Subunit: 498 residues, 2 copies
């Protein structure tokens, strides 16, 4: 039954740490596969107060860039704070200078969320117009880039999609009346000029409210389509959180655009209210789009439950605080691309392998019901990853995720989206991070590889943290690389093959 | 993967049979439990045309009453047509005289759906104002009873709830404005006066549409509450011609206080589905747990149940179900206490569910379900539980008939707490709803058997049989085989002796 955490080890995820001057050698137990060569780069908050001035929210602490390097069975660990305007000015003025998502002190450039490649460069990011070029070898900070210099968006998510050729797609709200713009950044060309200088708006999605865009964290992409899910979480001494509100009547509107023709498709897909942070995968199956999502049932903003004061409470209180929260659920939606009026009033989802439905109404809305893939009481399958390079945007079978127990990460999970079978890794008093998949270079199968996760493990005698390596087939442990220092929460990252 | 039925044996479910003059001895294989003593009584259509005039719909064929009797490890089988007005007048005139659900030929009394007890008596029914008293031992027809003689309802469902003392609750629409009335029939008293004569209206549920009641097939009952689910299938020629789907209402859920006989004005709402069968309902702290066999969408599922379509070859049957609503077992959780300080939040604070209920500003309470079972075009339907001991109470197990693009082809058990399932199936065998009988010394909820009637047409095979499975694991315990066909049956009961 229910896994419990009375010792309160999870509080270490939210405790300030010091950066390192140089990389440190981790102590390896088991055997790290010799084909595993490259760097796991991850981002998280690393400084949770400036002197006696606290940051209040999980998404406020100062960006810290982490690196595990793998070479010939050996592992090192390094971390450096990102020298953003937020961090530099805070160090200079010795106070909180720039307003953060949930702390009132100029838009924040605190890139604590993710890192991604553009041409030969790498950028750490949050969700604003500012991204920060960083050196993936040394973790030094290179420069600040303002997306507003190049394209018409107010911000951009921390979850761009990267195509196999290096083309980058993202979404942000804009003044197209409010709208949402898809931005494309090209691959590096022979001239080698900055791909960001060649950014353009591909297509625009309409907004459900003239003056209130929904909060958008991620989106879906296939070879031929772009999918955007417009939730009821709306943006209306203030901080960013103060601007959010819930629309009680709209439910969720889903939108598709033709990627190659750069055209919005006026299909009115609709469903019941949920929050959404992470798309899992999206693909085309006959004339339908399969849309796999990590949902939170309800319209209250899940971020209201992620203040540091609440995440640092003792365990019975953490559980109590999540009692009225939206419930997490992995759902498959299926969107028909062909809408035939002759079928008005019927289920259009004629696929053999799903219980998802899509009902064509007389007013032309298309009401969707999901196929539930995974559902546990206050137990989220979240921070989803797939074999993205080979199966992103395509028919697939496996997803990896971080299991959240009343919002505390405490296990790693694998899901067969076809059969709903699951696998789990967990250890008492250990709190893992998002799992990243690395394929065996010569794999022909989808799940022939490892997953990497950073695990916090406070306790008498124990090494305080470690990089965990699991077999992707069954989440069995292959190795771990232990370090002698704490590592705070990290949200997203990547594995750069070397 | 997909189970296929190319041979097309299911067609025998919809083929006319003759009644019997007296009980046949069935051939036993395995072991009939020695503690099983009594009669399995079931109803279904048994005559699917009158001469050259066809009945069109699965719910039109003339009611046939079936009995398997169990005593000391042996089994007999008997069946007789119910001598309703519809059957008798059809026999007298050698044509279809009374309009049926889906066949235009004066309300039908064709009691082909179910049988239940009232005091010392048994009644076969359909969904109208007419129920037919019948003799459970000989299968003879005794009397037509018009419920309109006793209480104001236009009809009543074929799924009354029956409390342990014999009190019968049912629901039917009435001319309140349209409304829905809960009828209560008391237990037999010391006078032995006909309990129907003492029928009364307990409480009334309001209707979403002033002139259009929803179709109601069943309802929920607990010790303290009555639960009614108002679906988008509306009643605005034959009966089927009067149905329409309301596209924008979704589903409205309703509760009434059973003991205080009071409607509770809580506006529970959710997305559109058809509902035929409640599974079970119970109370858990301040919440009603409502377990349902749903069909996702607002098109009326009965549109897919015309005999011409159910008698097609298997590739065509599958094709015909492509755009049908998808079946899904769902758990909804209804908060009984609504606090306005929680507006905008999930009220379902229970530890063991992912069902939600969000209090909106307009006072509507938007529900999302916990899904318990879901398979593509594969329904868990005709649900049954250990009803005497667990009906209306916290429970763990449900039994059902599995429908494969509307063709019955397997038996299923579901643990509603863990979602574990068990299945019984055999090629070219088409079972009926499974009915649970407790072992006399039962310590656990699933200490017992399920009984199902199975059709198995084929070269060198007995055409039909009573199947007995162990309720613990759905492993086969025995069969009682007969040498004649048995058409589809919908519902029934086991009457202990
Ligand atoms: Fe994210
Ligand atoms: Fe029924």
């Amino acid at each position: 039954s229910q896994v419990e955490h009375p010792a309160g080890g999870y509080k270490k995820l939210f405790e300030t740490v010091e950066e390192l001057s140089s990389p440190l050698t981790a102590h390896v137990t088991g055997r790290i596969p010799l084909w595993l060569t490259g760097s796991l780069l991850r981002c998280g908050p690393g400084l949770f107060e400036v002197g006696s001035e606290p940051f209040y929210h999980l998404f406020d602490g100062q960006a810290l860039l982490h690196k595990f390097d793998f070479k010939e069975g050996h592992v090192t660990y390094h971390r450096r704070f990102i020298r953003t305007d937020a961090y530099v000015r805070a160090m200079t003025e010795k106070r909180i200078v720039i307003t953060e998502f949930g702390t009132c002190a100029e838009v924040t450039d605190n890139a604590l969320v993710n890192i991604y490649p553009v041409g030969e460069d790498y950028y750490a990011c949050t969700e604003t117009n500012f991204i920060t070029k960083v050196n993936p070898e040394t973790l030094e900070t290179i420069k600040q880039v303002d997306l507003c210099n190049y394209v018409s968006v107010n911000g951009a998510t921390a979850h761009p999609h990267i195509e196999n050729d290096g083309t980058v797609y993202n979404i942000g709200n804009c003044f197209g009346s409010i709208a949402y713009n898809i931005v494309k950044i090209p691959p590096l060309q022979a001239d080698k000029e900055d791909p960001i200088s060649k950014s353009e708006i591909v297509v625009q999605f309409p907004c459900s409210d003239r003056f209130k865009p929904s909060y958008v964290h991620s989106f879906g992409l296939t070879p031929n389509y772009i999918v955007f899910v417009e939730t009821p979480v709306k943006i209306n001494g203030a901080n960013y959180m103060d601007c959010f509100e819930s629309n009680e009547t709209m439910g969720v509107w889903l939108h598709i655009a033709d990627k190659k023709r750069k055209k919005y498709i006026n299909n009115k897909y609709r469903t019941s209210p949920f929050n959404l942070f992470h798309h899992i995968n999206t693909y085309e199956d006959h004339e339908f789009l399969i849309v796999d999502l990590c949902c939170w049932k309800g319209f209250e903003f899940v971020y209201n439950y992620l203040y540091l004061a609440n995440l640092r409470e003792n365990w019975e209180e953490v559980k109590k605080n999540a009692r009225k929260a939206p419930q997490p659920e992995v759902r498959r939606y299926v969107l028909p691309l062909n809408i035939d009026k002759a079928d008005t009033g019927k289920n259009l989802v004629t696929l053999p392998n799903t219980t998802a439905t899509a009902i064509l109404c007389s007013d032309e809305t298309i009401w969707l019901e999901p196929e539930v893939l995974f559902s546990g009481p206050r137990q989220a399958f979240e921070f989803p990853q797939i074999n993205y390079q080979k199966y992103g945007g395509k028919p697939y079978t496996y997803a990896y995720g971080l299991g959240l127990n009343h919002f505390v990460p405490d296990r790693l999970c694998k899901l067969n989206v076809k059969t709903k079978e699951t696998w789990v890794w967990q250890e008492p008093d250990s709190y893992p991070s998002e799992p990243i998949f690395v394929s065996h270079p010569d794999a022909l199968e989808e799940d022939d590889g490892v997953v990497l996760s950073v695990v916090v493990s406070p306790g008498a005698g124990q090494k305080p943290a470690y990089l965990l390596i699991l077999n992707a087939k069954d989440l069995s442990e292959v190795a771990r690389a232990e370090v002698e220092i704490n590592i705070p929460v990290t949200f997203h990252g990547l594995f750069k093959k070397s």
